[PDB]
Subunit: 332 residues, 3 copies
């Protein structure tokens, strides 16, 4: 009887940050209430000023990370305001039935809907838009995110002992297929609808024009670099709704990795690079041991350094010469 | 001494169906006899009427699934009738030695051969044609299938308890590279031999023109949708002989997945999406919990919804509102 | 106190061979000293005589495999002689901090540097060049290799029992992106610097022109085929610094596979084909059971047989008819 369960309302935050939550559940099962508003907006995705018509959940690419516990109910109010132009919906890979909820959430502009589902399996999972006949166009326009379903007793290592993270970040990786004219210049449209047949032809090449973290080339750099301190335990959730990716922390490792994101499985240890298949979310746990700048990339290095799939951590603290040292600095 | 072993003759059925077999072996080791006839035929692969010259085992793409138990002998009579034009052979990834049998099975039109091999390792494995100098052309013309080698005591979960399936389907996923003229229209040839140098150039782009389940866009839909009932336990075997794939059941999960198909390993649990590397067969076990239409796709959504890698399940039974429900239907 | 530790100097050998080492450590922790010299050279990569300007560690593509034990220190003297034209450095995925050492090893021509790092995690790992702003160009010009960090008590199976290899080979797989003119012919340049903007445009297609083992089409064939004997236990280390690969031994299996290369994890058993994500090294252990020629390929068969990712083993010994036999040889 759901009506006897506590209801909690959560306000979502913008990626790469994650809304406040408890790792080990401090209550019994709850109905966890989220609201998301769909926003179609123009987005500048690179340093050259290339613009697309992005389709978003809550104004960001990716959509925000939702965090619940195993056997909570998720109740999502989904709003499509009348300033949008397209029909949208939502499919949760965490959920069971009705095309992940996609069959029950089709909202024209000016409509809203409320879906509830039980979070029966622990893990990180992708959610994304999936309207009949226009699935890849919506997804590769940025209409995807993830949800983390924590076990009620939090995360465990390969021997079943607790793993507690100090910080958590969400990296959404987006493949874009910007249409190009004959000479290779990117095209521009006034509405999303205008772009449709060009977008399909661009997708059909299977060759993205941009691959980015958090919606743009250089989004996780400079003043927007991820931060940590030496000795901190950091969980990085990474999703790709459409295309394989192979994350790698330059200068570090994935101490404990759930590459396909499902926490009833033991983690893989000591990973250099791991594969997150398209349509999956994964999670990697690392404890920082050295200060400095680290780069977090897709380790297809062309995708990283030419197409944009690279961000930075800035880590503060004490240098440990036992782990690495320059014996003779570069010299003639 | 093989001559003292029982011999059983099996008649194969067309994918996605699988020939009758026992999960737990009810006899000791046997010689299991199969016959396959090679058929080169014209195949229409999409709704536009694009035709290729397909090269098949037993008239289908994929070839039929063969099922034996660990430490059975497989004896295959392979027939290349004189109505075909090409030399063919067979390589079993389940087998040991002679290029998986490819070195011993080279048959010109008008020839036949009988190979025997011992099935020493449990798992699902790919088989495919592999003639010297023309390997990828034969494979990507549809000349591949799979064989399942069950452990003698059937399948086990991660804790070694029995997993029994009620139904089993075989999904063969095929990447085609149809040659194109200057403007982008698909070419047509009278014989397979005519297409050869154009086929190579098309393969070299590494970009398929079509990716399909069971030989055509829409083959596993409509009256050809896969069926199940709520409460049924379904094993889906999925092979890709040449290119990576990332299957996903929309609205469900892979409860127990052997993504690289080898049953001495524990399954991965609770998968949303899994990676089957090209040249591999994998297997996923799911118990249906909700009725309705489900889509089974490659979760590169362009490959699924534009290039054709999508099929349907139709599941009958009772709706469970506790798992999912529409709280407020779409409305203004 | 490092100054009290034994120092051992190792001379590296050319791939696919590996320098002499002990599987089970016969001493305590040591400082293991390696020297590598950077060589920029012209390389002929295919049977047509296509030439590139390769950037190498120690004159080979890949760079040599380095072998140490867990909790050894690696001290690398890296030399960039004044006959080279570019700035280079080295990033070890085995190491912790400073961008894997890349931040501390930037050497102009005429310079050298000595880096030391502690090998804290057991596994095979990629190393590669990674100069600021030119990372993928250096890597896809062949400037990568691997390092194996053995556990102090050698390798273990899934039940923790010793696995001892009789032989070890290193296969480095290289994706090249040779620029092409309008008609599709490969271009030629006098210096590496000349090629730069054409190289970027070629990389951006995400479509390699060649994928090769040990630096050239056909490098691991003929008199350069890998050898073994029936009954021998062979470890094959396989690295790909930039792009996914799916190795497969035609006629055999991966008995024990660490597909992502990290030895604290149990191996996957009985693999037909496995996925090594780009930016990773993996390792596969096989015991040969049949004599003959075997092909070791990337099982995207186009990448193998058209683009060049294929080599051979030649195995000597006795044929076992129980495992495979031709019952009726090909005949009318
Ligand atoms: O500004 N809407 O794409
Ligand atoms: O956007 N209508 O609630
Ligand atoms: O699905 N492409 O990695
Ligand atoms: O191929 N996926 O980056
Ligand atoms: O999907 N297990 O990480
Ligand atoms: O009809 N034979 O391709
Ligand atoms: O096709 N000859 O048996
Ligand atoms: O081998 N291509 O996924
Ligand atoms: O890249 N394989 O779909
Ligand atoms: O290959 N083991 O699923
Ligand atoms: O010959 N140096 O590229
Ligand atoms: O190349 N200078 O040591
Ligand atoms: O990163 N390409 O497999
Ligand atoms: O897609 N990697 O071969
Ligand atoms: O990464 N473990 O094979
Ligand atoms: Cu949408
Ligand atoms: Cu999906
Ligand atoms: Cu054939
Ligand atoms: Cu094969
Ligand atoms: Cu370099
Ligand atoms: Cu790297």
């Amino acid at each position: 009887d759901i009506s006897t369960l506590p209801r909690v309302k959560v306000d979502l935050v913008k990626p790469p940050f994650v809304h406040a939550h408890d790792q080990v559940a401090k209550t019994g099962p709850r109905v966890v209430e989220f609201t998301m508003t769909i926003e179609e907006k123009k987005l500048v995705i690179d340093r050259e000023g290339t613009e697309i018509h992005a389709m978003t959940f809550n104004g960001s690419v990716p959509g925000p990370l939702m965090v619940v516990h195993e056997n909570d109910y998720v109740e999502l109010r989904l709003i499509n305001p009348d300033t949008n132009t397209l029909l949208h919906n939502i499919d949760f890979h965490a959920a069971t039935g009705a095309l992940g909820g996609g069959a029950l959430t089709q909202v024209n502009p000016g409509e809203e809907t409320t879906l509830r589902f039980k979070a029966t399996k622990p893990g990180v999972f992708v959610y994304h838009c999936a309207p009949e006949g226009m699935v890849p166009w919506h997804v590769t326009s940025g209409m995807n995110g993830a949800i983390m379903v924590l076990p009620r007793d939090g995360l465990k290592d390969e021997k079943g002992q607790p793993l507690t993270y100090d910080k958590i970040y969400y990296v959404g990786e987006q493949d874009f297929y910007v249409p190009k004219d004959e000479a290779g210049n990117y095209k521009k449209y006034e509405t999303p609808g205008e772009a449709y047949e060009d977008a399909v032809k661009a997708m059909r090449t299977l060759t993205p024009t941009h691959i980015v973290f958090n919606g743009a080339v250089g989004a996780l750099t400079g003043d927007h670099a991820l931060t940590a301190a030496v000795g901190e335990r950091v969980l990085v959730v990474h999703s790709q709704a459409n295309r394989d990716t192979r994350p790698h922390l330059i200068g570090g490792h994935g101490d404990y990795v759930w590459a396909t994101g499902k926490f009833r499985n033991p983690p893989d240890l000591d990973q250099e690079t791991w594969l997150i298949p398209g349509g999956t979310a994964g999670a990697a746990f690392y404890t920082f041991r050295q200060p400095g700048v680290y780069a977090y990339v897709n380790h297809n290095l062309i995708e990283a350094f030419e197409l944009g799939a690279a961000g930075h951590f800035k880590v503060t603290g004490e240098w440990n010469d036992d782990l690495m040292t320059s014996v003779v600095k570069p010299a003639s």
